[PDB]
Write a protein that holds these residues in place. Structure first.
Motif, PDB file in Angstrom:
ATOM      1  N   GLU A   1      13.728   6.327  59.744  1.00 14.23           N
ATOM      2  CA  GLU A   1      13.612   7.384  60.733  1.00 14.23           C
ATOM      3  C   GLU A   1      12.286   7.277  61.493  1.00 14.23           C
ATOM      4  O   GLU A   1      12.258   7.346  62.724  1.00 14.23           O
ATOM      5  CB  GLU A   1      13.727   8.767  60.073  1.00 14.23           C
TER       6      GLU A   1
ATOM      7  N   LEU B   1      12.281   4.153  63.829  1.00 15.63           N
ATOM      8  CA  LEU B   1      13.116   4.332  65.001  1.00 15.63           C
ATOM      9  C   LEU B   1      12.485   5.331  65.965  1.00 15.63           C
ATOM     10  O   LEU B   1      12.440   5.107  67.173  1.00 15.63           O
ATOM     11  CB  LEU B   1      14.517   4.770  64.554  1.00 15.63           C
TER      12      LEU B   1
ATOM     13  N   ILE C   1       9.448   3.651  67.828  1.00 16.42           N
ATOM     14  CA  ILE C   1       9.679   2.723  68.928  1.00 16.42           C
ATOM     15  C   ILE C   1      10.232   3.491  70.135  1.00 16.42           C
ATOM     16  O   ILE C   1       9.977   3.092  71.269  1.00 16.42           O
ATOM     17  CB  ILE C   1      10.597   1.517  68.547  1.00 16.42           C
TER      18      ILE C   1
ATOM     19  N   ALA D   1       7.146   4.787  71.758  1.00 17.04           N
ATOM     20  CA  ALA D   1       6.466   3.628  72.336  1.00 17.04           C
ATOM     21  C   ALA D   1       7.109   3.238  73.665  1.00 17.04           C
ATOM     22  O   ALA D   1       6.416   2.957  74.645  1.00 17.04           O
ATOM     23  CB  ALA D   1       6.491   2.437  71.369  1.00 17.04           C
TER      24      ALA D   1
ATOM     25  N   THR E   1      24.665   6.720  67.751  1.00 19.06           N
ATOM     26  CA  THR E   1      23.534   7.092  66.921  1.00 19.06           C
ATOM     27  C   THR E   1      23.586   6.334  65.597  1.00 19.06           C
ATOM     28  O   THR E   1      22.572   5.829  65.122  1.00 19.06           O
ATOM     29  CB  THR E   1      23.528   8.604  66.680  1.00 19.06           C
TER      30      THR E   1
ATOM     31  N   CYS F   1      20.768   3.818  64.000  1.00 19.91           N
ATOM     32  CA  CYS F   1      20.297   4.080  62.643  1.00 19.91           C
ATOM     33  C   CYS F   1      20.581   2.894  61.716  1.00 19.91           C
ATOM     34  O   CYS F   1      19.737   2.526  60.893  1.00 19.91           O
ATOM     35  CB  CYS F   1      20.945   5.349  62.094  1.00 19.91           C
TER      36      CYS F   1
ATOM     37  N   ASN G   1      12.395 -12.017  71.443  1.00 21.93           N
ATOM     38  CA  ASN G   1      12.279 -11.412  72.760  1.00 21.93           C
ATOM     39  C   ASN G   1      13.587 -10.770  73.217  1.00 21.93           C
ATOM     40  O   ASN G   1      13.573  -9.779  73.946  1.00 21.93           O
ATOM     41  CB  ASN G   1      11.831 -12.441  73.793  1.00 21.93           C
TER      42      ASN G   1
ATOM     43  N   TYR H   1      14.859  -2.265  74.764  1.00 24.81           N
ATOM     44  CA  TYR H   1      14.407  -1.711  76.036  1.00 24.81           C
ATOM     45  C   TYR H   1      15.598  -1.190  76.831  1.00 24.81           C
ATOM     46  O   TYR H   1      15.559  -0.081  77.375  1.00 24.81           O
ATOM     47  CB  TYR H   1      13.641  -2.749  76.854  1.00 24.81           C
TER      48      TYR H   1
ATOM     49  N   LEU I   1      18.524  -0.249  75.626  1.00 27.24           N
ATOM     50  CA  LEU I   1      19.057   0.939  74.959  1.00 27.24           C
ATOM     51  C   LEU I   1      18.246   2.159  75.354  1.00 27.24           C
ATOM     52  O   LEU I   1      18.805   3.234  75.564  1.00 27.24           O
ATOM     53  CB  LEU I   1      19.056   0.814  73.433  1.00 27.24           C
ATOM     54  N   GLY I   2      16.926   2.000  75.425  1.00 23.38           N
ATOM     55  CA  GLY I   2      16.070   3.097  75.836  1.00 23.38           C
ATOM     56  C   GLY I   2      16.436   3.586  77.219  1.00 23.38           C
ATOM     57  O   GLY I   2      16.532   4.797  77.439  1.00 23.38           O
TER      58      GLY I   2
ATOM     59  N   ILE J   1      17.887  11.176  71.446  1.00 23.70           N
ATOM     60  CA  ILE J   1      17.358  11.569  70.140  1.00 23.70           C
ATOM     61  C   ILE J   1      17.570  13.072  69.984  1.00 23.70           C
ATOM     62  O   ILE J   1      17.801  13.769  70.978  1.00 23.70           O
ATOM     63  CB  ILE J   1      15.856  11.218  69.965  1.00 23.70           C
TER      64      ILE J   1
ATOM     65  N   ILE K   1       2.497  -5.498  72.490  1.00 29.57           N
ATOM     66  CA  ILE K   1       3.806  -6.153  72.526  1.00 29.57           C
ATOM     67  C   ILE K   1       4.011  -7.000  71.275  1.00 29.57           C
ATOM     68  O   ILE K   1       5.112  -7.055  70.739  1.00 29.57           O
ATOM     69  CB  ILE K   1       3.983  -6.993  73.810  1.00 29.57           C
TER      70      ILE K   1
ATOM     71  N   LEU L   1       5.119  -4.599  68.655  1.00 26.62           N
ATOM     72  CA  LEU L   1       6.485  -4.121  68.872  1.00 26.62           C
ATOM     73  C   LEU L   1       7.510  -5.216  68.604  1.00 26.62           C
ATOM     74  O   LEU L   1       8.577  -4.956  68.037  1.00 26.62           O
ATOM     75  CB  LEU L   1       6.649  -3.577  70.297  1.00 26.62           C
TER      76      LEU L   1
HETATM   77  C1  LIG Z   1      19.376   9.880  65.079  1.00 27.22           C
HETATM   78  C2  LIG Z   1      17.943  10.262  64.858  1.00 27.22           C
HETATM   79  C3  LIG Z   1      16.901   9.795  65.603  1.00 27.22           C
HETATM   80  C4  LIG Z   1      17.191   8.856  66.693  1.00 27.22           C
HETATM   81  C5  LIG Z   1      16.456   7.835  67.143  1.00 27.22           C
HETATM   82  C6  LIG Z   1      16.775   6.891  68.182  1.00 27.22           C
HETATM   83  C7  LIG Z   1      18.211   6.835  68.619  1.00 27.22           C
HETATM   84  C8  LIG Z   1      15.876   6.042  68.701  1.00 27.22           C
HETATM   85  C9  LIG Z   1      16.012   5.035  69.698  1.00 27.22           C
HETATM   86  C10 LIG Z   1      14.993   4.272  70.106  1.00 27.22           C
HETATM   87  C11 LIG Z   1      14.917   3.232  71.078  1.00 27.22           C
HETATM   88  C12 LIG Z   1      16.177   2.957  71.852  1.00 27.22           C
HETATM   89  C13 LIG Z   1      13.784   2.558  71.326  1.00 27.22           C
HETATM   90  C14 LIG Z   1      13.494   1.506  72.192  1.00 27.22           C
HETATM   91  C15 LIG Z   1      12.338   0.855  72.304  1.00 27.22           C
HETATM   92  C16 LIG Z   1      12.056  -0.247  73.108  1.00 27.22           C
HETATM   93  C17 LIG Z   1      10.896  -0.880  73.350  1.00 27.22           C
HETATM   94  C18 LIG Z   1       9.594  -0.403  72.751  1.00 27.22           C
HETATM   95  C19 LIG Z   1      10.851  -2.046  74.145  1.00 27.22           C
HETATM   96  C20 LIG Z   1       9.879  -2.910  74.426  1.00 27.22           C
HETATM   97  C21 LIG Z   1      10.093  -4.064  75.213  1.00 27.22           C
HETATM   98  C22 LIG Z   1       9.242  -5.000  75.633  1.00 27.22           C
HETATM   99  C23 LIG Z   1       7.788  -4.894  75.294  1.00 27.22           C
HETATM  100  C24 LIG Z   1       9.668  -6.138  76.404  1.00 27.22           C
HETATM  101  C25 LIG Z   1       9.002  -7.247  76.752  1.00 27.22           C
HETATM  102  C26 LIG Z   1       9.512  -8.380  77.527  1.00 27.22           C
HETATM  103  C27 LIG Z   1      10.336  -8.188  78.601  1.00 27.22           C
HETATM  104  C28 LIG Z   1      10.625  -6.867  79.252  1.00 27.22           C
HETATM  105  C29 LIG Z   1      11.098  -9.292  79.198  1.00 27.22           C
HETATM  106  O1  LIG Z   1      11.952  -9.106  80.049  1.00 27.22           O
HETATM  107  C30 LIG Z   1      10.786 -10.666  78.737  1.00 27.22           C
HETATM  108  C31 LIG Z   1       9.318 -10.707  78.367  1.00 27.22           C
HETATM  109  C32 LIG Z   1       9.031  -9.773  77.169  1.00 27.22           C
HETATM  110  C33 LIG Z   1       9.600 -10.345  75.878  1.00 27.22           C
HETATM  111  C34 LIG Z   1       7.514  -9.796  76.911  1.00 27.22           C
HETATM  112  C35 LIG Z   1      15.461  10.004  65.136  1.00 27.22           C
HETATM  113  C36 LIG Z   1      14.909   8.837  64.316  1.00 27.22           C
HETATM  114  C37 LIG Z   1      14.455  10.216  66.267  1.00 27.22           C
HETATM  115  C38 LIG Z   1      15.451  11.297  64.297  1.00 27.22           C
HETATM  116  C39 LIG Z   1      16.356  11.190  63.108  1.00 27.22           C
HETATM  117  C40 LIG Z   1      17.742  11.030  63.624  1.00 27.22           C
HETATM  118  O2  LIG Z   1      18.679  11.528  63.016  1.00 27.22           O
END
Ligand SMILES: CC1=C(/C=C/C(C)=C/C=C/C(C)=C/C=C/C=C(C)/C=C/C=C(C)/C=C/C2=C(C)C(=O)CCC2(C)C)C(C)(C)CCC1=O
Length: 137
Positions: free
Chosen positions: A15, A18, A21, A24, A52, A56, A76, A83, A85-86, A97, A123, A126
């Motif tokens: 939890e 997830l 990020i 983040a 969901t 999870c 990557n 990203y 999904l976000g 969420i 990065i 992450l």
């Molecule tokens: C159900 C539920 C919840 C739900 C939680 C949930 C559903 C959470 C979902 C969270 C999500 C979908 C998080 C996504 C994060 C993405 C990041 C940090 C991406 C970074 C990307 C980068 C740096 C990319 C880099 C790059 C790019 C762009 C390129 O294109 C190529 C270059 C490179 C590789 C450098 C909780 C846990 C909150 C509560 C409990 C509970 O029940």
């Protein structure tokens, strides 16, 4: 601090990982998918509860077909997947969420540490945070 932060992240429960990020992801905004595109379309086709559960499942390293697929991708591509999904959650295509959710103190400490790092270091953290999600036997 990068290895220490990666280590601590890995100790957080599913939890906390997830949630971290997600927050983040939201912070980045203040500053191609190869064979993962289909999986994103599969998640978009699921109902909210199943969406969901899918996310999870990844953070819990559960044994599911999506988790096995995810595990096979490059680091990557795993990042790009999250990203996207976000973005989909922000846009209303994927379940959001829980409303009003507050990041735990433990997760917040890690996020605060990340935000103090250089962008490249952030990065790296992450990338390593998500690389071992999904399932490996
Ligand atoms: C159900 C539920 C919840 C739900 C939680 C949930 C559903 C959470 C979902 C969270 C999500 C979908 C998080 C996504 C994060 C993405 C990041 C940090 C991406 C970074 C990307 C980068 C740096 C990319 C880099 C790059 C790019 C762009 C390129 O294109 C190529 C270059 C490179 C590789 C450098 C909780 C846990 C909150 C509560 C409990 C509970 O029940």
């Amino acid at each position: 601090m990068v290895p220490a932060t990666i280590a601590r992240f890995s100790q957080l429960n599913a939890e906390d990982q997830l949630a971290l990020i997600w927050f983040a992801y939201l912070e980045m905004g203040k500053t191609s998918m190869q064979l993962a595109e289909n999986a994103l379309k599969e998640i978009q086709a699921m109902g909210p509860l199943q969406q969901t559960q899918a996310m999870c499942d990844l953070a819990n390293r559960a044994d599911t077909p999506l988790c096995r697929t995810y595990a096979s991708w490059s680091p990557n591509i795993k990042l790009g997947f999250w990203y996207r999904l976000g973005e989909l959650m922000e846009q209303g295509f994927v379940a959001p969420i829980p409303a009003g959710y507050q990041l735990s103190a433990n997760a917040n400490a890690v996020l605060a540490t990340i935000q103090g790092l250089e962008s490249g270091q952030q990065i790296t953290v992450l990338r390593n945070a998500v690389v071992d999600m999904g399932f490996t036997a």
